[PDB]
Symmetry: C5
Subunit: 310 residues, 5 copies
Amino acid sequence: PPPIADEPLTVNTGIYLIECYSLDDKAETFKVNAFLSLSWKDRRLAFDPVRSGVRVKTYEPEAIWIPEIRFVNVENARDADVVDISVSPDGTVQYLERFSARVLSPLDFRRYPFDSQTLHIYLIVRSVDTRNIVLAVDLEKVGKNDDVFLTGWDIESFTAVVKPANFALEDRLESKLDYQLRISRQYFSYIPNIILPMLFILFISWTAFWSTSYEANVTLVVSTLIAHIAFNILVETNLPKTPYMTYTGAIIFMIYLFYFVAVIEVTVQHYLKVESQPARAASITRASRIAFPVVFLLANIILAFLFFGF
Amino acid sequence: PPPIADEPLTVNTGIYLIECYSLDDKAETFKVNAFLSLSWKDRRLAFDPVRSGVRVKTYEPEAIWIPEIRFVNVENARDADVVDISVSPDGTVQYLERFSARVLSPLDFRRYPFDSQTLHIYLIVRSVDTRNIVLAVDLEKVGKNDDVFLTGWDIESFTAVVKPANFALEDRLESKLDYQLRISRQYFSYIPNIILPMLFILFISWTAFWSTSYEANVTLVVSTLIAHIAFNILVETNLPKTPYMTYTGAIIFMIYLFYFVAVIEVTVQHYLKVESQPARAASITRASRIAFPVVFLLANIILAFLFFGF
Amino acid sequence: PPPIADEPLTVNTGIYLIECYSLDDKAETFKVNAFLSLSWKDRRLAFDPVRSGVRVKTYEPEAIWIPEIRFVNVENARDADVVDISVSPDGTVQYLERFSARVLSPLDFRRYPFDSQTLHIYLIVRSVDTRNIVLAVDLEKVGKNDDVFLTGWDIESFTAVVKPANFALEDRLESKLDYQLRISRQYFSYIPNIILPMLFILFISWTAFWSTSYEANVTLVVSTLIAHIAFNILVETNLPKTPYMTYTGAIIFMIYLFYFVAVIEVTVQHYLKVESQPARAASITRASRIAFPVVFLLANIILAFLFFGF
Amino acid sequence: PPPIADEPLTVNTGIYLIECYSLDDKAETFKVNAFLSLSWKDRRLAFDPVRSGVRVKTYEPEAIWIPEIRFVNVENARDADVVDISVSPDGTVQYLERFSARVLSPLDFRRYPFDSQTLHIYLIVRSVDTRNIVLAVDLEKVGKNDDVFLTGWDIESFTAVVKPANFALEDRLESKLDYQLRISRQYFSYIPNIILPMLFILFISWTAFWSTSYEANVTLVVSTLIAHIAFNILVETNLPKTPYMTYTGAIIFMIYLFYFVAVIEVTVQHYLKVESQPARAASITRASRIAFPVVFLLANIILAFLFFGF
Amino acid sequence: PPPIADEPLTVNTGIYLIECYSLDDKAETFKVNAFLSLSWKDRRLAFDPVRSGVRVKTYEPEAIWIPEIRFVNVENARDADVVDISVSPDGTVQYLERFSARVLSPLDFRRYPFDSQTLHIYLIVRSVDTRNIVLAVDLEKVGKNDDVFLTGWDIESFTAVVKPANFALEDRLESKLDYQLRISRQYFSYIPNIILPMLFILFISWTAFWSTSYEANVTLVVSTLIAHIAFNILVETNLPKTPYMTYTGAIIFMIYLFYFVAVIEVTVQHYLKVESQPARAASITRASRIAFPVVFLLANIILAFLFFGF
């Protein structure tokens, strides 16, 4: 029994984040616990302040007609408990639930460890014999405690795109809103745990540039190649199969090449010291000691620039 | 109380994908969040436009008789919320739910990293004292947002096999429809992370072909054999126990052989340089440097052709 | 209100497998999605064909008394949706649900990779002031689609043990039936991924039998000992702690011994070449080259025979 | 509406285990599927055998007042289905549910691989305006099928502590019972998979006691040190963070020491063979060959005794 | 229908922990099973002791108006079963549920293995046409059995912050309470399993300080570098991405440096013994044997002090 109206019914939405948690990079989902605020005029139940009762009249969800508000990018149905319905005299309804869903928003791993994201929450509504349109009441969308967590992320801003997008979908029109959570990843733990360790082993790798033993150099350059695969895997692990290239996926793959041409050198600095041409060998080896570090630091500037600086 | 009819009742189905996610290769399942659209004529409730009420009459699921529509290849019962029932004057019902199930469709790993799939969703319906037949209303089966995700997959086309397959099952007939989601895997991340790394270590492996030290060559050829097992496992891991051979499972197993005959060589190039017949040794070793790379690149063309090219 | 009867009430059961999936070897459980078919005479509601209504009368589960049928070896309560109740005029009820449980049936890992299983589904029923007995109606127990999956297994046959076993349990008798799913494991992927790789590394292991360098032989025999522990673990991992010995657990443990006496040899072939008795050393080493491979191939025939051939 | 009584109401409990499974060592929980049997006299509904109906009267849970029986050491609320309520003429109620919970009972890892456990299930009941007391009816507590599983454990005995413990808790008294499941771990798979393999690698470790090559001995003693860390981790993995010392945690940590002083030796047997004092070197090394094995086998007897023999 | 009042309604809360478990460090959540005790005066149902019935009157949740009490830092809605409602003559209600939630409280990993935590449980309440305020009745908040578990933690004290914090939230005021569980981590298992093992391998690392073989020293210093990465990973694994530095994260990262400058030394002690300047080499190496251990033990005191001692 929807509220009889002369035009499009405005439902006035507002989300207040109470808890954020479980941002699953692999899954590309997070979990929210918030307030939903709906409000619309159903004049059909305005109620004579003085004539009876009190200032405001309280209802159970069954009584009133409530607008069916669905979240769009959600796995299962939004899990909600009604907190209060309060009809104002003029026929204004104030609805308030507390829901918990896990939302499905895509992330952009392009700058992986140093990346910021904008999460989305949608809210559609479908029409019947009247149209409905959603819209934000900003006093109820200050959504966010001074307690919102989200481990390993810094929360920048919860806001809402005030103009809804109104599709037609299956011979009935729908009204969609875009709530936006802007977060930036807490890169750091990545330094002492991946980045720094990753470099160290690469440096040790080409400690083999001041050595003449094949046996000790294959042991060197190869044993580190392994440890890098370990790191390579450790990372490719907490991360989805993007169809593009991640920043660390680059520098991680680049690094693979320095292990190759290092191995290529050590190997050459040998079919050229067993050929009694050590003239040339100790010549190559010596250049390496400069070329490798320099080309690296260069490729990183090049690489780095190509990702962030553009 | 099913709608009394002179013949077979046509229910008119249509799915509109809203969300796709969690394609579990190991499990052989995905998870969908869509619209179900059913529509049938239950003349038994045609309703005098002018004589009363309005253009269309709204119902709750309890009132009307609704057809029991089950998904076939689903784990548990399809998890649904009713969005609207709308009876037309002539007795035409327009049903619309939003469901979320996880579907069980087999995948074909034969071309693994470079594979396309066709996922299925079924929908049966069983009969009573009248027969039911399902069929697609294509205006409602344009199922798919311009937002459908499915991480690590490219979505080609959501369509429906318009002719139902009508079994008899346990002295009552059923009507089944085949909805079809066609996806192709986003191979790529596999290059910088598996394929390329895998090759590199193999090349390094037979760097030992320009060396004379057993100690450094077993260190070489063997340390890489290990890293390959690492890769072998990392892969066999995100992949089910198919009874056939995968493409990468081939080239991965092939590679095992090159580590064997490499080890076989290095070993022979030694019980043949400790036998003062270095005449022959440096002869073998030299050939290897060509045979290995050539046989490989050959076996890959052979192998590759055998999978895709046929 | 159970159907008043002159003797034991026969409920007529039948399962029709629609989906099979998630056979968890570690857990010792699988997951089924089937039809349950119950049928009994409750004369207490026979209904005058001509006198009123139609051929068959449809009921909701509340109306009728339905027999409480429980699955025995199930984790939680069987998860079911009623599909139809249809009373025949003579008072014959035709019940049909579609359920989904995860069943708990023990597996026999004795021949692990090459093993067949017989899964069980039970169904009890308890009595009240009348006795109940279950029994199979084979037309409804043809349970199994031509689509039943069960990844990594071949499905042989779904049948039912027609004679129920009737316990007394807590001063009331129960009737139990045994539905039986016979599957055989799809060994194969195990070859290119475990068995073959496992052997290769063992062969390489005793490549050290045609070598004289300790340094290169400990590197050899020991580096492969590691890779075997890797395989050992990869396997002991997807497998429960059986109190008996698995087939692969045997050949995997046997293999451990060849790494020991190999290491034992290389070691001896040295405190016996540093003792200027190379007379004996190169004598031992040479025998090994035959003894190891022969004893192995022998122990496998012995072992193999002991498991399958008996 | 609780049964009016002249004193403390005795509810007569009894559990009959139907399924046991999922003993999670890490979590310290198992999962049971049993029968709960309650029985009490509610004279307030005695019922004239002859005067009406039959021998026993059947009820639905709503009618009667049933005692609220909670499990104490349970994660969530016990998950139950009522199987029968049967009132006897004298006003004796026979209740019977089938429940499934996962229980939280602490385990004692002190003898880890060779340990026995006593699991607990509790059952409280709280009072109102009458007191309740629980107690075991042993005919209904023979709880246990000849089918109870519990993979990797041997089930010794299901019994109940007949005297309840009656607390006061928050100005009302409660009655608690202790059901006890006594199981002993199936050590064995631990031998061919951890223990034996663990030892072998340790032996190989000090194969380095009959060798003179540093390069081959560091390769030896160190490569095995690694494999042990692998085992160390594989174990510390399926096991909780106990605040005491486990048996294998000991012998595993002990073993760490033999790798240290082995490494200490090999190292010393070198700054003492490069010092032209091989007099002493080959003297130490030779003693080791006896000291290590003997001290080990001794420390194990000492250790072993300290855990089991006391 | 809320209790008509002349001022702010006091609801009197109290939690009694029955079970604690599953403190997930990664997730930053634990799981509780407790009693909730609410009590308020609803004079609107005072009831004439003598005039009728008995001392206290029992209700079902539907009858009475009950205050809606929500947990704040909870994932989903608190999962509860009502245990008793008991109205006193004066109109005093005694409510008692048993709930189970999983709570979301932040942990402080700063001293990781040696850290104490204070977990939180919140409880809000929202107002309507009267205000509500929560407060602790300490006789009901002695919350905690002498059985509360929480594996791997020592439970210090369950108490409650008696003064509620009263926000205004969306034009209605709320009353929040802070229940506090104080636990300290059971460090120990960390010694025999991480700390001790970690050190040992570091010591062995610089056993290479009493050696002259590059081949054996790269084998040494590098093979341990690997094992440390293993440990590094094993730890970074059961631990969240904090934006600060953990204590073990420090000493773990510190240790990375000793492997670098160790590798730096061994390498230098060689381009300086192949340069016929062994004068200097054996000079460096000798200092190391003191500098390394001393700088370490120093850096640890420095580090340690910086974390705990401040």
